[PDB]
Design a protein around this nucleic acid. Structure first.
Ligand code: ADP
Ligand code: BEF
Ligand code: MG
Lengths: 94, 864, 87, 104, 24, 93, 94, 97, 78, 95
DNA sequence: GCTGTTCAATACATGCACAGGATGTATATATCTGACACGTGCCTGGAGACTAGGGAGTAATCCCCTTGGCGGTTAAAACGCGGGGGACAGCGCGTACGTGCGTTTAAGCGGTGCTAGAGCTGTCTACGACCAATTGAGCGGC
DNA sequence: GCCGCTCAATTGGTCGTAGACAGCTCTAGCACCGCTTAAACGCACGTACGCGCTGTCCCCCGCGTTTTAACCGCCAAGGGGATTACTCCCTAGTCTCCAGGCACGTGTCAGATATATACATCCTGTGCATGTATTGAACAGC
């Protein structure tokens, strides 16, 4: 393939697919770490963790879409942290 | 359709498929093996390196240096090797803290690494042969070689004329496998009823490797008896009584005596694949036994070359191999590939894994279309009755269904009725013998369980766990948030050793007079911080002075980390085996520990990976550092010492932390143990047959001695030997008579059984010539035919043949005809011991007819 | 060894290439190397303020097991209704 | 426009496939009001049937043109997000195992 | 001052009055 | 435990719109969630309309107006047409 | 229509915190809307809390958790303390 | 003698209990529910009027007005999070200062 | 009509939003966005008014239409 | 006064006050026209029009805040239509 | 008379054609697999029928609020011009991101084994509604 | 600001149902090991993109004048909303019976796949024909 295409090849692949993109075990450990601040020794029904992963990945994907629109508005092509901050502030996510 | 939308949407295309076509085998370094004298620039100036190349075997290893290498792929691997060498040399030469024994270990490491690579250039089997056309327009015979201790990936084509010099015996084995008399397509078909069986009084002569014991003959007799009735069963002999030997001997008997050659599958626990395969190589070396393992490419290569005769055929493909050894993992990975085969027999080693009828292994194996099944397990562990019922249902689908699932209580009248009925009802299909009954030559085992007091660090941990003292536990973690979702696990961890917790060692090295570099005091903490370590050191010191050697089992790999560090700091030589250790390294570790010169004193073993099927009879002591919830796993560990190969009294120590959960685990194991004790045409000849017999006679001459082999190898259809003798004699007499009629008319084509155009003179001449050849070769050199020579007798020269041909070529060609018969020019040219293999061609002068007429001339001349 | 293991941190279990894949599905061509720790912060904030509500529902029920239903309810409170887990 | 209403089931009297009995029970058990008129569950079951038929029609079109015989969440997502009005109805809903719309 | 709230609020200045002397 | 779902009625409507196609269990749980959600939306808005008018009863007029509030564009007027047709059949039958 | 208002009680609460100040009629109507809105949001959450648990009754337990869901941070902690104090003093009276 | 004064509340517990019935939020409403809810409403009303009274003093005004309610709400992070989606009539903006 | 929302009114609104400079194209954008917002609110307000069988749109059903938009407005009743 | 200061002076003036900024009668005419397209001969309670103006102006002010953040993000000071279109798209109003 | 060379006859060696045997290919037939239909049983929810009371619907009246017009004044809005500042484009340079490669680590799936927690069932008691009567507070007007 | 009147809250008692408490059973959740393989991480290098800088041109903002419309006040009329009263119909509640849906097993039908049989083509072996070389005999010359 031509140089530099692989970014487009990845975009095309990952937009076609539907699987969860974060590894399941790391995410489950993060969820349990976070939960233990609110109540110690909670158990989790496994579908609860899958629902949290589905929701958080859909959230991050939509946030990256808005961040990309912010970067394009700068007339960059690299997304920068201030693009995420601008997207979240206009969303009112603060 | 019946509903239709009435919304005026435009049409949409939802097709998400796309193509990215709008966006549209080299001599690299593979491995660096060793280095010798000819910073990194000192590496370039001073040193020369042994390079293993890509696409080439370890025979093609070459010494090289940077200017000799130049620029090539893989040079970064040479940079990394130089960097590692630099670090090794700095630690060896520079480091003033390096010890004498550390220097010895660093020198031993050179041997340890090189002793592996010294295997990889030795052939283990030839897989296949080809003729490769060269750009020179000639062709070279090549053998696809699989190297020792390598998978079927990095199997490599090699010059046959080299491999025959390197590894003659393996080429002979390959030729035997190609000339195999026991190929699955010739399998007998006792589809209606199998022949009756008489007890074997002594082991059949085809059992090569050694002598079976009387109880092993009895086991084979029982297996054969059940097979004749059509019944599946269990080999339940106590662990280490030769169930592997009995299984190999039974499969050998089934193939040779019954002629049920055919694909037999044996599914085996990974750690025991070598021992199974080494048993086949000793006890049944004539069997084409394949081991199915390794990465996708390796086993794809196994399927491509090894499985099929004519792998490119496109209907009802048939199998080249007698036995496939496979690990449970690959029965899941390659379920479709293996499940497609018409397996004749299945044996499962350590069958108790099947005890969960819901397991994917059970579903997979139970879907295989195998004709007969066999289970091997020393512990048909009735951990509950439903788990035994799953095994029996696996043997007996839709037959002898155990639906009375109710568990036995300690006492009921219905319980004693049902247990007694079950016991007598199962007994026909389970064969079990015990070491004390079978083999009084075994020295006894004995077991002691050692009560151990908790250390104070353990005492405070165990208290904090019971009181759920999350704050004190978090301080014991230095802010790592503790959790108690499985209190039982944390209590068992505290009972074994506090260094299993994140910062219990930090909390004692904070007694900084013990801390940091202090060799003595790091060990002092590591030992005194738990009672089991104190007792273990007392035992290990005694055993070291006595000269015993000890296997130490644990149900926690981090405990084996702690023990391994403790032993290394005391400088003790030890081996380790847990399920993270790859197959080759564990193979090496077991071979080394069983080596009679081995210095290793301790073997650290995981109870799961190391408790099953290993042979470690060169140890005599076992420490079960913690007990399992299942007693049979501990008995399996104890059996790893107590093999049939034992030669000294075996001493087993359990370590039990007193006043802890460990004793509750002991009592539940004992209750399950006591529950387990409580349960414990032929004359019809057609035209095709006459034509085949005539061609066989013109190939081999007199067939009447070989005829058993010719029927076995498919040269002739299955028919009575007497009728082939009769038809041979009748054909020879008719040929003689027709020649006599030709002579009387002259002072030879004839018809036989309606076959036309048979030549009488060819039969008589070929029979005379091959009889003379056979008698000459057997009379001169029955024992070693390659030494045969024609002496002074020199025939006429070759008629301008394009290849150098001499008395030597005539001799070797006659040896080829002696081995393969007339007309077998493919085998004669392919057999590399004859050296002709380059000389003979398919427009070329030495054609098939030319060589045939040369052979006939030579045989006439030697008769003359 | 006994003591050489490094625990990393659980938020670091959301790896750089996982964020790369999420950005790819979002159509991002090119991505500054600072975006990873920002994304981990944003994820932690979202997942905290969802899990706090889920645990509040679990504790009001006097359960000890968080269930897919009180996750779905915690998300519904945020206006992030999720289909496919019941509710 | 007409139906025989031969069956006792109130759905058949309305000509609906959806369960008017359930919709009435749920309206009554849900504490939406003190009182529930007899026409409410018929109207609501009819609207639920219409919306589910509309989604399943578009999802079946998407499954067909992707050349698969079963509707899967990928196809529900494609149907919803390609329809302006279903996307405005479900503009705050996440569909499990749905993707994004591919850029084209 | 009969009722107070225990909230650990920061101090705040609410005065909106402003000048333009920095614009002059 | 036991639970109850629209699945059989979703199958019935599917076989009315695409008789040859199937539907995955996951997709069926999506459709069940969608039906429950839209039901709760329409019922909750009809409840608010009743309370705002000091009415004690939810009628077809409440459901109709809740549908006109909740559904966008043509999807609303078609749903209202299906509802008024079904109520007409139910009354005349 | 004898319209219900909180005005006299907002006045009585005002005179506990700032007895010197008054309150504009517009600001009073904004306080009235604020009280109605917070009431409706808490009662709604307590309602669906009861429904989720298949209970028929709204108790102090439901109001307490509806407050912990609805109010942010320390404002919740103090509101819950005030509510439990009032319920205790009520329960220890006639 | 009122139910409010037994709890010690200024807000009408009887009114809250009547509203909890009228709204048909559930089949039953417990006796403690309206006391708790009235107490929480009183607390939030007091905290709002506290901050608006401060804002009125800082602006040197005797009456609290919507400007002061807007200032009080928007300057507090928690009240601003409670009232984030809320528009206050005749409120201004926070000045950039 | 929409053109009665004058250029300086949009300036004043931008100034309260802190806008330092304002392109001459912003006025027709702002008029479009305002018209869309008013259409979305008045549709729901009139729907509540017509369901009540009234002919007068009231501050209360405007407040309800805004509560539907998630834009609740204090100080008009409700 | 320093050159070009008056814009910031206006920013101060309009942020400090609470006045409605659109003329009342023009906005009433616009509301009447839009309602007339939905339903003829409607009447408006005057507080209804005041509430609708207050919500409309609060919405426009918050939109101009988000637009100004989009302009600043482009290293720019003049707000441009594409800033409004970005703010509205991110905040979910592209409907 | 014997030897060497030439001539003639015969045998071997090669090429081509025909026959025979094996392999590949296509079609027909039968078996295998999966799904649906029908029968039976059980349990639960809906449907149908009857009764009573309350809610809604209808009608009438009164009052308030909204709409429309008129007039004057003032401030806001609109038009027009000039100058300066900011936006946009082009260019150059340096750093950061991305691509390749080698090596290591950890995820995923399968299994093992136990225990706690969830869910269900049954019983009993207290609390909440409903109804009636009495009392005190809040609204409205003087 | 205070007093009078009306409506809602409070008080008491009774009845029925919901919730609380206890016990039991089974499923699913937790931790850890085995085994393989792919993904992730470390490291280097090169190019492209981001950011600074500069110049030019166009557009916006400031200022002045003029013009238009909004706002405020006032008046008038009619319509619509709200309240009150009465009556009828609809829905809730109760009881009883039927039907549908869950649930499983079995058989038959439908569709696909595999195997068997027949025919065609290609490859190999053998036989016959032709050419060339070899062998044997005779003739010629020394
Ligand atoms: N017939 C025999 N002769 C000599 N050694 C034997 C024989 N049978 C078994 N062994 C020894 O036993 C060891 C194998 O143990 P094995 O009995 O196969 O384990 P198990 O049967 O418990 O799986 C081998 O190393 C071998 O030396
Ligand atoms: F059971 Be044996 F030791 F493999
Ligand atoms: Mg074994």
């Amino acid at each position: 393939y031509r140089p530099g295409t692989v970014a487009l090849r990845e975009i095309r692949r990952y937009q076609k697919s539907t699987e969860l993109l974060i590894r399941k075990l790391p995410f489950q450990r993060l969820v349990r770490e976070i939960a233990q601040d609110f109540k110690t020794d909670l158990r989790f029904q496994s579908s609860a963790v899958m629902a949290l992963q589905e929701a958080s990945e859909a959230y991050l994907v939509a946030l990256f879409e808005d961040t990309n629109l912010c970067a394009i508005h700068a007339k960059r092509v690299t997304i920068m942290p201030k693009d995420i901050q601008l997207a979240r502030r206009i969303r009112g996510e603060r | 359709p019946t509903r239709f939308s009435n919304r005026q949407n435009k049409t949409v295309n939802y097709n998400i498929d796309y193509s990215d076509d709008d966006l549209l085998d080299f001599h690299g370094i593979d491995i660096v093996i060793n280095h010798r004298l000819k910073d990194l620039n000192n590496c370039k100036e001073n040193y020369e390196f042994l390079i293993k190349w890509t696409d080439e075997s370890h025979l093609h290893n070459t010494w090289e240096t940077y200017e000799s290498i130049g620029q090539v792929r893989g040079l970064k691997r040479l940079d990394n090797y130089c960097k590692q060498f630099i670090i090794e040399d700095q630690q060896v030469r520079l480091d003033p803290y390096v010890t004498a024994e550390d220097i010895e270990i660093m020198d031993m490491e050179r041997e340890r690494r090189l002793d592996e690579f010294e295997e990889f250039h030795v052939p283990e089997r030839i897989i296949d042969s080809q003729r490769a056309s060269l750009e020179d327009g000639t062709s070279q015979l090549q053998y696809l070689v699989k190297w020792r201790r390598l998978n079927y990936d990095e199997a490599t084509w090699e010059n046959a004329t080299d491999i025959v010099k390197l590894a003659p015996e393996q080429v002979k084995h390959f030729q035997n496998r190609e000339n195999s008399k026991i190929l699955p397509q010739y399998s007998s078909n006792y589809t209606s009823q199998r022949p009756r069986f008489e007890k074997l009084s002594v082991q059949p002569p085809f059992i090569k490797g050694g002598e079976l014991r009387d109880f092993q003959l009895t086991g084979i007799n029982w297996m054969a008896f059940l097979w004749s009735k059509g019944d599946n069963g269990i080999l339940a002999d106590e662990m280490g009584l030769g169930k592997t030997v009995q299984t190999v001997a039974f499969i050998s008997w089934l193939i040779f005596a019954r002629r049920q050659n055919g694909p037999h599958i044996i599914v085996v626990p990974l750690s025991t694949m070598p021992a199974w395969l080494d048993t086949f190589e000793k006890w049944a070396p004539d069997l084409n036994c394949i081991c199915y393992m390794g990465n996708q490419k390796s086993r794809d290569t196994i399927r491509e070359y090894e499985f099929y005769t004519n792998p490119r055929a496109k209907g009802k493909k048939t199998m080249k191999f007698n036995v496939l050894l496979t690990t449970y993992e690959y029965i899941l990975k390659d379920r479709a590939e293996l499940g497609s085969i018409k397996w004749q027999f299945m044996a499962v080693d350590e069958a108790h894994r099947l005890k969960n009828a819901e397991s994917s292994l059970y579903e997979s194996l139970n879907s295989f279309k195998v004709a007969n099944r066999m289970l091997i397990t020393g512990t048909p562990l009735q951990n509950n009755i439903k788990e035994l019922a799953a095994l029996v249902n696996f043997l007996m689908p839709g037959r002898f269904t155990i639906d009375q699932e109710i568990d036995f209580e300690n006492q009921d009248e219905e319980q004693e009725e049902y247990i007694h009925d079950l016991h007598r009802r199962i007994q026909p299909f389970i064969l079990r013998r015990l070491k004390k009954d079978v083999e009084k030559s075994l020295p006894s085992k004995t077991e002691r369980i050692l009560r151990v007091e908790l250390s104070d660090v353990q005492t405070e941990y165990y208290k904090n766990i019971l009181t759920k003292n999350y704050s004190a536990l978090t301080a014991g973690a230095k802010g790592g948030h503790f959790s108690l979702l499985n209190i039982m696990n944390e209590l068992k961890k505290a009972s074994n050793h506090p260094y299993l917790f994140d910062n219990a060692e930090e909390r004692v090295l904070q007694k900084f007079g013990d801390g940091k570099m202090t060799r003595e005091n790091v060990l002092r903490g590591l030992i005194m911080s738990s009672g089991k370590m104190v007792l273990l050191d007392q035992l290990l010191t005694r055993l070291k002075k006595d000269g015993h050697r000890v296997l130490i089992f644990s149900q926690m790999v981090r405990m084996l980390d702690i023990l391994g560090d403790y032993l290394s700091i005391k400088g003790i030589n030890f081996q380790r085996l847990d399920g993270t250790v790859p197959s080759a390294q564990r193979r090496i570790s077991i071979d080394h520990f069983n080596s009679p010169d081995s210095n290793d004193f301790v073997f650290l073993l995981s109870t799961r990976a190391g408790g099953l099927g290993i042979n470690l009879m060169t140890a005599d002591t076992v420490v079960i550092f913690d007990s399992d919830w299942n007693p049979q796993a501990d008995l399996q560990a104890m059996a790893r010492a107590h093999r049939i190969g034992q030669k000294n009294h075996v001493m087993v120590y359990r370590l039990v932390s007193k006043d802890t959960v460990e004793e509750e685990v002991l009592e539940r194991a004992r209750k399950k143990m006591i529950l387990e004790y409580a349960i414990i045409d032929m004359d019809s000849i057609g035209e095709s047959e006459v034509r085949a017999l005539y061609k066989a006679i013109l190939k081999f001459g007199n067939l009447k001695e070989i005829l058993d082999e010719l029927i076995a190898d498919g040269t002739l259809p299955v028919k009575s030997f007497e009728k082939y003798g009769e038809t041979y004699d009748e054909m020879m007499e008719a040929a003689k008579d027709c020649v006599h009629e030709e002579e009387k008319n002259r002072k030879v084509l004839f018809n036989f059984k309606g076959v036309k155009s048979l030549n009488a003179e060819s039969l008589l001449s070929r029979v005379e010539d091959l009889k003379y050849l056979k008698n000459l070769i057997n009379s001169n050199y029955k024992d070693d035919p390659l030494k045969f020579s024609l002496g002074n007798n020199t025939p006429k020269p070759v008629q301008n043949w394009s290849s150098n041909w001499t008395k030597e070529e005539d001799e070797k060609l006659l040896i080829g005809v002696f081995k393969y018969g007339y007309g077998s020019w493919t085998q004669i040219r392919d057999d590399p011991f004859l050296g002709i293999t380059d000389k003979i061609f398919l427009k070329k002068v030495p054609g098939a007819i030319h060589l045939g007429r040369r052979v006939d001339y030579l045989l006439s001349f030697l008769r003359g | 060894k006994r003591h050489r293991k490094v625990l990393r941190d659980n938020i670091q279990g959301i790896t750089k290439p996982a964020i790369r894949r999420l950005a790819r599905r979002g159509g991002v061509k090119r991505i500054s190397g600072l975006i990873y720790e920002e994304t981990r912060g944003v994820l932690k904030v979202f997942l905290e303020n969802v899990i706090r509500d889920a645990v509040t529902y679990t504790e009001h029920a006097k359960r000890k097991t968080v269930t897919a239903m009180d996750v779905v309810y915690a998300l519904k409170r945020q206006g992030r209704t999720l289909y496919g887990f019941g509710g | 426009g007409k139906t025989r209403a031969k069956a006792k089931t109130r759905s058949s009297r309305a000509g609906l496939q959806f369960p008017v009995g359930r919709v009435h029970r749920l309206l009554r058990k849900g504490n939406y009001a003190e009182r529930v008129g007899a026409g409410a569950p018929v109207y609501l079951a009819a609207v639920l049937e219409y919306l589910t038929a509309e989604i399943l029609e578009l999802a079946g079109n998407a499954a067909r043109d992707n050349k698969k015989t079963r509707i899967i969440p990928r196809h529900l997502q494609l149907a919803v997000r390609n329809d302006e009005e279903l996307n405005k109805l479900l503009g705050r809903v996440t569909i499990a195992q749905g993707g994004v719309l591919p850029n084209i | 001052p009969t009722r107070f709230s225990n909230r650990q609020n920061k101090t705040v200045n609410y005065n909106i009055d402003y000048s333009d002397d920095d614009l002059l | 435990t036991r639970k109850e779902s629209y699945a059989i009625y979703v199958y019935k409507v599917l076989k009315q719109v695409h008789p040859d196609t199937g539907i995955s269990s996951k997709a069926m749980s999506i459709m069940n969630s969608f039906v429950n959600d839209v039901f709760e939306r329409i019922a909750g808005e009809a409840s608010r309309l009743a309370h705002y008018n000091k009415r004690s009863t939810i009628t077809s007029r409440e459901i109709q107006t809740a549908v006109r509030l909740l559904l966008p564009g043509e999807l609303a007027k078609h749903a209202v047409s299906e509802g008024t047709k079904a109520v007409t059949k139910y009354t005349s039958a």
